[PDB]
C-alpha cells in the first residue's frame, strides 16, 4: 500500500542501443547484448551535411528504410528519420544446403535492383610542409624526366597543380596528389641522383585494392598557412557473397550463395524471398523475438500500420495471429512454398515474411589478401605486418 513513487515506464531502463531491439522481453539477454554491440557499426545515414564534409571512411546506404515492428523509443532516437538498414523478405528454410551454419541465400534479381547497396567515401588528406624554409614541398605534376624516386603509377589523371579533378574515374596504384620535395646534389647521390638534379617524388597514391570515382577535392590553407588539400572518392559496394549481414536479434552471418528469381522458391501468390536463413539458428540461440518481429512485420506490411514493438506492453502472440488470420494468410506465419528448380510443392510449409536487416562494416573486399614474395622489414628482415603494406 505504501507506494511512494511510480515508474514512468519500464522500457526506459534500457540504453540507446537496446532500444532498437523489437520485443527484447521475448529474447534472451546475451542476444540483446550482441545486438547492442552490432548496432554501433551498421551502415546508415548519420547526418545530412555529408555532402559538404570531408569525413574519412564513410558508408551511406542507397535506400534506407524504417522498420515495421518499431519501438516507441525510436521516436525519441530519430531512427525513423535516419534508419540504418532495410526490410527484406526473409524465408526460414533448409533449401539447397547453402544456408547451413548461419549462412544466407540472397536473391540476385533483388541485388541488381539496388538492395543493401551502399556508398563508401574515402578521404585522402595531403599537406605540403617547410622544414627550415630552405626546403619547400610543392604540389605539382612530376615529370618523368627530372623526378627521381617516382612511383610506377600513372600520372595522366593529374592536372597542372598536381591534383585530380573530381569526376575522373580512378583505380588502385593511381596517384591522386602529386607532391615533390627538393633535394641536394651532395647529400645522397644515390643511383641516378646526380643526373636527375631536380627533385624527388613524394606523392600520395590511392590504395592498391581500391577503385572508384573522385567525388570532391578541396584546397585550403590550415592554421599556420600551409596549403593542404583534401580528397574524397566515392565507390558503390554491391553486396557480394563475402559481405556480412546482421539483424535486430543478435543474428549475424554472411551470404552463402546468390540465386535468381527462377532459382528461388516462391509462394502461391508470387512473392519471392530476398533472403533465406537456416532454421538451426533459432533453437540454439533461443531468440523467439526474431519470429515475432517477422510475424508482426507481416501483419504491419498487410494492414499498413507499423506495429508497436515496445518491450513491456500487453501485445501477445495470439492477437497477432488473429490479426494475420483476418488478412487471409496462415495465423502461424507458415505459407505453402514451391520449389524453384522443379516447380513442385514443398512437403513442409516455410516460415515466410519480411524482417528488418542491417549491413555491417565487415566486408570481404577489405579482408582478402595474399602475399607471395614481398617487402621485408628493416629490423628483422621478415615479412611486414599489415594488409596495406602487403604483409604476410
Amino acid at each position: 500500500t505504501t507506494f511512494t513513487h511510480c515508474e514512468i515506464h519500464p522500457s526506459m531502463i534500457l540504453g540507446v542501443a537496446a532500444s532498437i531491439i523489437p520485443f527484447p522481453d521475448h529474447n534472451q539477454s546475451p542476444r540483446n547484448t550482441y545486438q547492442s554491440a552490432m548496432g554501433k557499426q551498421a551502415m546508415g545515414v548519420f547526418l545530412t551535411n555529408y555532402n559538404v564534409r570531408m569525413d574519412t571512411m564513410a558508408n551511406i546506404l542507397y535506400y534506407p528504410q524504417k522498420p515495421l515492428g518499431t519501438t516507441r523509443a525510436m521516436e525519441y532516437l530519430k531512427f525513423r528519420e535516419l534508419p540504418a538498414g532495410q526490410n527484406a523478405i526473409v524465408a526460414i528454410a533448409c533449401y539447397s544446403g547453402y544456408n547451413q551454419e548461419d549462412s544466407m541465400i540472397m536473391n540476385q534479381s533483388s541485388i541488381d535492383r539496388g538492395l543493401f547497396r551502399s556508398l563508401f567515401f574515402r578521404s585522402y588528406m595531403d599537406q605540403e610542409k617547410k622544414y627550415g624554409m630552405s626546403i619547400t614541398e610543392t604540389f605539382e605534376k612530376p615529370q618523368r624526366t627530372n623526378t627521381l624516386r617516382m612511383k610506377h603509377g600513372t600520372y595522366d589523371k593529374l592536372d597542372d597543380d598536381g591534383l585530380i579533378a573530381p569526376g575522373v574515374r580512378v583505380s588502385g596504384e593511381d596517384v591522386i596528389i602529386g607532391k615533390t620535395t627538393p633535394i641536394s646534389p651532395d647529400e645522397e647521390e644515390l643511383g641516378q641522383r646526380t643526373a636527375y638534379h631536380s627533385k624527388r617524388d613524394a606523392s600520395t597514391p590511392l590504395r592498391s585494392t581500391e577503385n572508384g570515382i573522385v567525388d570532391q577535392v578541396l584546397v585550403t590553407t590550415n592554421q599556420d598557412g600551409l596549403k593542404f588539400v583534401k580528397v574524397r572518392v566515392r565507390t558503390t559496394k554491391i553486396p557480394q557473397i563475402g559481405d556480412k549481414f546482421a539483424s535486430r536479434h543478435g543474428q549475424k552471418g554472411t551470404i552463402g550463395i546468390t540465386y535468381r528469381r527462377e532459382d528461388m522458391p516462391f509462394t502461391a501468390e508470387g512473392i519471392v524471398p530476398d533472403l533465406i536463413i537456416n532454421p538451426h539458428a533459432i533453437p540454439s540461440r533461443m531468440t523467439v523475438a526474431h519470429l515475432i518481429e517477422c510475424l508482426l512485420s507481416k501483419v504491419a506490411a498487410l494492414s499498413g500500420n507499423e506495429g508497436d514493438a515496445s518491450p513491456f506492453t500487453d501485445i501477445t502472440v495470439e492477437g497477432i495471429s488473429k490479426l494475420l488470420r483476418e488478412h487471409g494468410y496462415q495465423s502461424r506465419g507458415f505459407e505453402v512454398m514451391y520449389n524453384g528448380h522443379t516447380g513442385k510443392k514443398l512437403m513442409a510449409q516455410i516460415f515466410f515474411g519480411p524482417t528488418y536487416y542491417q549491413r555491417l562494416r565487415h566486408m570481404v573486399d577489405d579482408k582478402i589478401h595474399a602475399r607471395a614474395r614481398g617487402p621485408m622489414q628493416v629490423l628483422t628482415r621478415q615479412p611486414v605486418e599489415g594488409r596495406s603494406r602487403d604483409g604476410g
Partner: peptide, 15 residues
C-alpha cells in the same frame, strides 16, 4: 497492436 501515429488528426479533431 500497432503504433498509433495518427494522433495529430485525433488531437486536432478533439481540441
Amino acid at each position: 497492436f500497432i503504433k498509433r501515429d495518427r494522433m495529430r488528426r485525433n488531437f486536432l479533431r478533439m481540441r
